[PDB]
Amino acid sequence: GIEKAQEEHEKYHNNWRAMAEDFQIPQVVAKEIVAQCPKCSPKTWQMDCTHLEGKVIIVAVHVASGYIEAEVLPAETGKETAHFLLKLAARWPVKHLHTDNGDNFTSSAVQAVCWWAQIEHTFSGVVESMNHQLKTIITQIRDQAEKIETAVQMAVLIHNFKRKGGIGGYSAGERIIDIIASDLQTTKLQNQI
Amino acid sequence: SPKTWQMDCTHLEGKVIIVAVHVASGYIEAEVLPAETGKETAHFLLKLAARWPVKHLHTDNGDNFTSSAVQAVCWWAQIEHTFSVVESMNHQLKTIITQIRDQAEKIETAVQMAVLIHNFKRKGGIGGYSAGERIIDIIASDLQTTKLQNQISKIQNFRVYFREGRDQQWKGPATLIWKGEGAVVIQDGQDLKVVPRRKCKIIKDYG
Amino acid sequence: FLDGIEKAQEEHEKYHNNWRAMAEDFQIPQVVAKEIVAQCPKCQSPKTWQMDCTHLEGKVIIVAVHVASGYIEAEVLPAETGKETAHFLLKLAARWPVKHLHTDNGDNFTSSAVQAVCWWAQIEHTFSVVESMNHQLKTIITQIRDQAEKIETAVQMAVLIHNFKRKGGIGGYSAGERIIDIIASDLQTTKLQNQISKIQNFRVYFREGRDQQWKGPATLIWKGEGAVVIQDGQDLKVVPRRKCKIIKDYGR
Amino acid sequence: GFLDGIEKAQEEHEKYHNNWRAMAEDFQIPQVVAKEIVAQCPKCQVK
Ligand SMILES: [Zn+2]
Ligand SMILES: [Zn+2]
Ligand SMILES: [Zn+2]
Numbered sequence: 007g008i009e010k011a012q013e014e015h016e017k018y019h020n021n022w023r024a025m026a027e028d029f030q031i032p033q034v035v036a037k038e039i040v041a042q043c044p045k046c047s048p049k050t051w052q053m054d055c056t057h058l059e060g061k062v063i064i065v066a067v068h069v070a071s072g073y074i075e076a077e078v079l080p081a082e083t084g085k086e087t088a089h090f091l092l093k094l095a096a097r098w099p100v101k102h103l104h105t106d107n108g109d110n111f112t113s114s115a116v117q118a119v120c121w122w123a124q125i126e127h128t129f130s131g132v133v134e135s136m137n138h139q140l141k142t143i144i145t146q147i148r149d150q151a152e153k154i155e156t157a158v159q160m161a162v163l164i165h166n167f168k169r170k171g172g173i174g175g176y177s178a179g180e181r182i183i184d185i186i187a188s189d190l191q192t193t194k195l196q197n198q199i
Numbered sequence: 200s201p202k203t204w205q206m207d208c209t210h211l212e213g214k215v216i217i218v219a220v221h222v223a224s225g226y227i228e229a230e231v232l233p234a235e236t237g238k239e240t241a242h243f244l245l246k247l248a249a250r251w252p253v254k255h256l257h258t259d260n261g262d263n264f265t266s267s268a269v270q271a272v273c274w275w276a277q278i279e280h281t282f283s284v285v286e287s288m289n290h291q292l293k294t295i296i297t298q299i300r301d302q303a304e305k306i307e308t309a310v311q312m313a314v315l316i317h318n319f320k321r322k323g324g325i326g327g328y329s330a331g332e333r334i335i336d337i338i339a340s341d342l343q344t345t346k347l348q349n350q351i352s353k354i355q356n357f358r359v360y361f362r363e364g365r366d367q368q369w370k371g372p373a374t375l376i377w378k379g380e381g382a383v384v385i386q387d388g389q390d391l392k393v394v395p396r397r398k399c400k401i402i403k404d405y406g
Numbered sequence: 407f408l409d410g411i412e413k414a415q416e417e418h419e420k421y422h423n424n425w426r427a428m429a430e431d432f433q434i435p436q437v438v439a440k441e442i443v444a445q446c447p448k449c450q451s452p453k454t455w456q457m458d459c460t461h462l463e464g465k466v467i468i469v470a471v472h473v474a475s476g477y478i479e480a481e482v483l484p485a486e487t488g489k490e491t492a493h494f495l496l497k498l499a500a501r502w503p504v505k506h507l508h509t510d511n512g513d514n515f516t517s518s519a520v521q522a523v524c525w526w527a528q529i530e531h532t533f534s535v536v537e538s539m540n541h542q543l544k545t546i547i548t549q550i551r552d553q554a555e556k557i558e559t560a561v562q563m564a565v566l567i568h569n570f571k572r573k574g575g576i577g578g579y580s581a582g583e584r585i586i587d588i589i590a591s592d593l594q595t596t597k598l599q600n601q602i603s604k605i606q607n608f609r610v611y612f613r614e615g616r617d618q619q620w621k622g623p624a625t626l627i628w629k630g631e632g633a634v635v636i637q638d639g640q641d642l643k644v645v646p647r648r649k650c651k652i653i654k655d656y657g658r
Numbered sequence: 659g660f661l662d663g664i665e666k667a668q669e670e671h672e673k674y675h676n677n678w679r680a681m682a683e684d685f686q687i688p689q690v691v692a693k694e695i696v697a698q699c700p701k702c703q704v705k
Contacts, residue, residue, distance in 0.1 A: 018571045019549060045549055072576050075250070092308065096315035097228070097250070099331070123315070132576075146422055146448055156245065163249035163276065168421045173577055173587050179252065180342055187339040190332060275420065349430075405597040656697035656704045 007031060008039075015039055019046060032196055048189040049101035051094070054133045055082065055108070058141070059154055064090055067136050068098070071181035074136060076162050078155045084113030091116065095123040099186070103127045140165060201341045202254035204247075206264070207285040208235065211293065212306055217243055220288050221251075224333035227288055227317055231307050237266030244269060248276040252338065255279050292317060359385045360400040375401060407633065408644045410434050411442075415642075418442055422449060437602055437628050438635055441642070452592045453505035455498070458536040459486060459512070462544065465557055468494055471539045472502075475584035478539060480565050482558050488517030495520060499527045503589070506530045543568065605629070609655035610636050612645045626652060660687045671695055675702055 011025045020028075022036035040046055050069045055062060062079040064087065075094060079086050087110045094100055103125050105111040111129075120127050143161040151157040170177045176184075201223055208217045217240065218229045228247060232239040240263040247253060256278050258264045265282070273280050295313040303309045322329045328336075358372040361383075373387035383399045385392060410432040417423060417432075425439040432439075443449055457470045466483040468491065479498060483490050491514045498504060507524070509515045511533050524531050546564040554560040569581050605627070611620040612634075624638035629652065634645050663685040670676060670685075678692040685692075696704045 018567055020571065024573055070576070070578075089307070089311070092311045092315075096311050096318065099319065122312075155242070159242075159245045159249050160275075163245075164421050166249065167252065168423060168427075170427045171424070173579060173583070183335060183339050183342065187335050190335070403594075405594050656693065658694070658698045 008035060011036065011039055015043060019043070023047075047102055048185050049099055050104060051100050051102070052104045052133050053091075053111070054106065054137065055087075055110070056137055058144070061154055063158065065133070065137055065140065066090070066094055067133055068178075068182055069104075069132060070185055071178050072132075072136065073178045073182040074140065074162055074165050076140065076158055078158055082110055084110050084115045087111070087113070088115035088119045091125075092119050092123070095119075095125065100125055104130065106130050200255060201337045202252055203257065204253050204255070205257045205285050206244075207259065207289070208232075208240075208261070208263075209289050211296070214306060216310065218285060218289060218292065219243075219247055220285050221330075221334055222257075222284060223337055225288070225330045226334040227292065227314060227330070229292065229310060229314055231310060235263050237263045237268040240264065240266065241268035241272045244272050245276070248272070248278065253278055255281075257281050257283065259283050356403075358402050358404045359383065359394075360402065361385065361387075361394045362398040369400070372404065407434075411438065411635075411642060411644070414439065414442055418446065422446065435628055436598060437605065438642070440598065440602065441627055441637070445640070451506065452588050453503055454508065455502075455504055455506070456508045456536050457495075457515070458510070458540065459483075459491075459514070460540050462547070463557055467543075467561060469536060469540060469543065470494075470498055471536055472581075472585055473508075473535055474588055475581055476539070477581045477585045478543065478565055478568050480543065480561055482561055486514050488514045488519040491515065491517070492519040492523045495523050495529075496527065499523075499529065504529055506532070508532050508534065510534050607655060609653050610634065610645075611651045611653070612636065612638075613649045615649075620651070623655075660685070663687045664691055667692065668695060671699065671702075675699065677702075678704060 007029060008031060011020075011029045011031055014020055014025065014029075022033065022040040025031065025039065026033050026036040048070055051066055052069055053064070053066045055064045057063070062082050064077050064079055066075045067073070077090055079090075091100075091103075100123065103120070105127065107129060110116070116127075119125075140161055143164055144157055147160060147164070148157055151160060166179045167177055174181075203222045204219055205222055206217070206219045208215055210216075215232050215235055216229055217232055218227065220227055230243055232243070253276070256273070258280070260282050263269070270280075272278075292313055295316050296309050299312055299316065300309055303312065318331050319329055324333070355374055355376065357375040359375050360369045360372060362369055370387075373385040376384040376386055376391070378384075378401065379396070381396050383394050383396055383401075385394060385399075411434060414428050414432045414434060418428065423431075425436065425443045428434070428442065429436045429439040452474060454473050455470055456473055457468070459466055459468050461467070466486050468481050468483055470479045471477065481494055483494070495507070504527070507529050509531065514520070516533070520531070523529075543564055546567055547560050550563055550567070551560055554563060571580070573580055575584070606625060608626045608629075610624045610626045611622075612624060613620050622638065624636040626634065627637055627642065628635040632647055634647055634650050634652075636643060636645060664687055667676075667681045667685045667687060671681065676684075676696075678689065678696045681687065681695065682689050682692040693704050696702050
């Protein structure tokens, strides 16, 4: 167990999550094994903003499943970005936020929202891919809706519940539900044992 | 039923707040509409159906809930609509809004903070769970049942080429049943048999 | 059966699903679902590699990367001529299916030996990901350098740790699982396309109910044990086998 | 081999528009390739 993980980290330098998965060890042991080497998550959310038809679309992505959430904005200020992040934190458990060097992602309202919701904001291949896929769905079903926001929300529905691709053969909504349920059971067993 | 949702609207400080409740868990989503026309109710329903799996919806006999836009949204998203819990959740959300009113200037930030408080900071019930853990566990268990019945046929769509004893030719494509660590169970000509692992080849055989 | 085909066409008209999902959901054969996708107007690479050279400790390291999965093959060269680059490209093309090679405008890549290798192995060469792969490989090489005596051992140990020990992406897969899943899905597509062309070289005269005459020549899509699916008048329909005649067609 | 027979039968059908049994007996090619030569001509028909 612990000696086998020490042999694996000695040879190949695995991280603590991969050792805790493949060897079934409590995570404090794997964290201590990784912290003892001198040579060296189910709630990571990335965000971005893009433009289409002169409008501003803001896209958040859950990384462990590919789960999307999009919104249409009349302005690119900090208050509407803070409202988007506050609604996302009120809907899903958000813990570790990842963004880029933008003008709205460094703001007082966004900082107040992150402080109130206890989110760790970090700055910088997945978000560009999800924006590209969402744009292809938008151009695929554009002529079924009059306004742009109806086409955006229909693209979000088709992306989350109608595209069963990838390796496992699962859509994004079933993936994120199974991932957070399994993580919750693992935290319950680690608290009980 | 694990996919039943109820919707209503209410008034607070001269505004119109629309509230949707997942019934089997007590899960709350809410928004602030500028009016009570059918377009805003249909847009709220479209965002809700794009976020969570909605299959069966219950409402009252309202003026925006009985509308052509809401009927078009339900036709496109395949929801079963029925007209006549939400009043109790409105009561709870109003009390939480009066609890933390002084931390926010506008009504909208107070609404979203009250939604987060009710969903993730109010633990009770039997097991000691909040509403979000209940709704996640409910939809996960239902998905596991239906996907079990499909996954068995998916695993039986493989083909196995095996070898018996003291014959050096590879026998024909039996069907896989279970793959172990040292043995493989196959069905061959309506005969279930067990072969060692080093005498088998499991293909999908596109052809 | 026909209810499954009608539900599949209405669901594709709403949401534009792919053919694997429609075949697994509505319980129809794959050639029928692929025809439903191929009849839509709005619905109409796994073999591309990139190459580069770099320097480390006075050596020359040549790196090839599969683009759609992130899969690395690397080697240490004694020089930087065109003959050694041609030998590396011939070994790579002999081990993995390479159809499209992307490089930069270096000297050793613009050479007669590399041109002869691309002519013999039928590769499309194009001059202009690998920078990120060189940086990632160099960080792993510095992370495990004290376990090896020579630079060649450290290079191959870093390639093994990159390909099989690092997990990331959507589902937490390594690069080897991703490249194998991608190439296997492409193989399934090409085998089904061969079956589709061989079936579609036929023709069907069918007789409807309450009539004695044969209708126009409809194209056969799927020929089962008791039923027959045909395309006629931009409409897919299921006829029983006792009211059909299938003949060969010569309309090249 | 009958590969030169395939090329010669294509030249002969481009001149005189033979049928397929005539080309299969004259040029000693199998029947499938002779039927394909008649099938690729837009003016003729295999019958
Ligand atoms: Zn280490
Ligand atoms: Zn389509
Ligand atoms: Zn002719």
